[PDB]
């Protein structure tokens, strides 16, 4: 849950992008007035847990996270998060 923002943000946030966190707002039911602040509101991906949830999370997570990101096509980070690098031995 938390590591899902602390790690995911380490792919798009770097540079304050207009995609990803923003594209989520489309499925998250947000607004430009807030999308404008989200980019600078204690990190969009970090605040997302409290912003998207509005209390803590769970309701808009676990299964909603993938939908909210897949319905728009934002596996750019999900892919990275679920595929860092191969090495060592065994799974």
Curated annotation (Swiss-Prot):
Name by which UniProt lists this protein: Death domain-containing membrane protein NRADD
Protein purpose: Modulates NTRK1 signaling. Can activate several intracellular signaling pathways, leading to activation of JUN. Promotes apoptosis. Promotes translocation of SORT1 to the cell membrane, and thereby hinders lysosomal degradation of SOTR1 and promotes its interaction with NGFR.
Part of the intact protein present: 138 to 228 of 228
Assembly and binders: Interacts with NGFR. Interacts with NTRK1. Interacts with SORT1.
Superkingdom of source: Eukaryota
Domain Death: 6-85
Expression by tissue: Detected in lung and testis.
Cellular location(s): Cell membrane; Nucleus
Phylogenetic placement of the source organism: Eukaryota, Metazoa, Chordata, Craniata, Vertebrata
């Amino acid at each position: 849950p938390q590591q899902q923002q602390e790690e995911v943000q380490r792919l798009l946030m770097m540079g304050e992008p207009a995609k990803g966190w923003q594209e989520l707002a489309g499925h998250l039911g947000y607004q430009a007035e807030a999308v404008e602040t989200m980019a600078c509101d204690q990190m969009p991906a970090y605040t997302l847990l409290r912003n998207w949830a509005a209390q803590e999370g769970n309701r808009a997570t676990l299964r909603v996270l993938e939908d909210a990101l897949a319905a728009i096509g934002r596996e750019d980070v999900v892919q990275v998060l679920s595929s860092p690098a191969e090495s060592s031995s065994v799974v």
